[PDB]
UniProtKB/Swiss-Prot annotation:
Disease linkage: Noonan syndrome-like disorder with or without juvenile myelomonocytic leukemia: A syndrome characterized by a phenotype reminiscent of Noonan syndrome. Clinical features are highly variable, including facial dysmorphism, short neck, developmental delay, hyperextensible joints and thorax abnormalities with widely spaced nipples. The facial features consist of triangular face with hypertelorism, large low-set ears, ptosis, and flat nasal bridge. Some patients manifest cardiac defects. Some have an increased risk for certain malignancies, particularly juvenile myelomonocytic leukemia.
Boundaries of the shown chain within the full protein: 358 to 437 of 906
Name this polypeptide is given: E3 ubiquitin-protein ligase CBL
Complex and partners: Forms homodimers; IFT20 promotes the formation of stable homodimers. Associates with NCK via its SH3 domain. The phosphorylated C-terminus interacts with CD2AP via its second SH3 domain. Binds to UBE2L3. Interacts with adapters SLA, SLA2 and with the phosphorylated C-terminus of SH2B2. Interacts with EGFR, SYK and ZAP70 via the highly conserved Cbl-N region. Also interacts with SORBS1 and INPPL1/SHIP2. Interacts with phosphorylated LAT2. Interacts with CBLB. Interacts with ALK, AXL, BLK, FGR and FGFR2.
Organism: Homo sapiens (Human)
Segments forming RING-type zinc fingers: 27-66
Entry remark concerning the domains of this protein: The RING-type zinc finger domain mediates binding to an E2 ubiquitin-conjugating enzyme. The N-terminus is composed of the phosphotyrosine binding (PTB) domain, a short linker region and the RING-type zinc finger. The PTB domain, which is also called TKB (tyrosine kinase binding) domain, is composed of three different subdomains: a four-helix bundle (4H), a calcium-binding EF hand and a divergent SH2 domain.
Post-translational modification: Phosphorylated on tyrosine residues by ALK, EGFR, SYK, FYN and ZAP70. Phosphorylated on tyrosine residues in response to FLT1 and KIT signaling. Phosphorylated on tyrosine residues by INSR and FGR. Phosphorylated on several tyrosine residues by constitutively activated FGFR3. Phosphorylated on tyrosine residues by activated CSF1R, PDGFRA and PDGFRB. Phosphorylated on tyrosine residues by HCK. Ubiquitinated, leading to its degradation via the proteasome. Ubiquitination is negatively regulated by IFT20.
Region (Linker): 4-26
Consequence of substituting residue 17 to H: Found in patients with acute myeloid leukemia; uncertain significance; loss of the ability to negatively regulate signaling pathways; promotes cell cycle progression; decreases apoptosis
Superkingdom in the source lineage: Eukaryota
Miscellaneous: This protein has one functional calcium-binding site.
Length: 83
């Protein structure tokens, strides 16, 4: 009945089934890598890709804020839907 609008699935009408929400992934410094390393006891999150580079430039604190770097641990966050 009335749900049949006069259109056609020429290419595709129902392709719009993607949400595209919030990407919980990614490192702010590079945007390509994700939060792989957590700087302790700072609690800052980024990828070792950026962090090593910064320490190769003397790791005078996190690359952003330059706050306390003592230790580092791996992260690996949950993707869920990074689409
Ligand atoms: Zn990065
Ligand atoms: Zn920090």
């Amino acid at each position: 009945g009335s749900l049949q609008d006069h259109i056609k699935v020429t290419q595709e009408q129902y392709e719009l089934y993607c949400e595209m929400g919030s990407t919980f992934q990614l490192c702010k410094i590079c945007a390509e890598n994700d939060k792989d390393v957590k700087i302790e006891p700072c609690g800052h999150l980024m990828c070792t890709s950026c962090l090593t580079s910064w320490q190769e430039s003397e790791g005078q604190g996190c690359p952003f804020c330059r706050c306390e770097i003592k230790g580092t641990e791996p992260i690996v966050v949950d993707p869920f839907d990074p689409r």
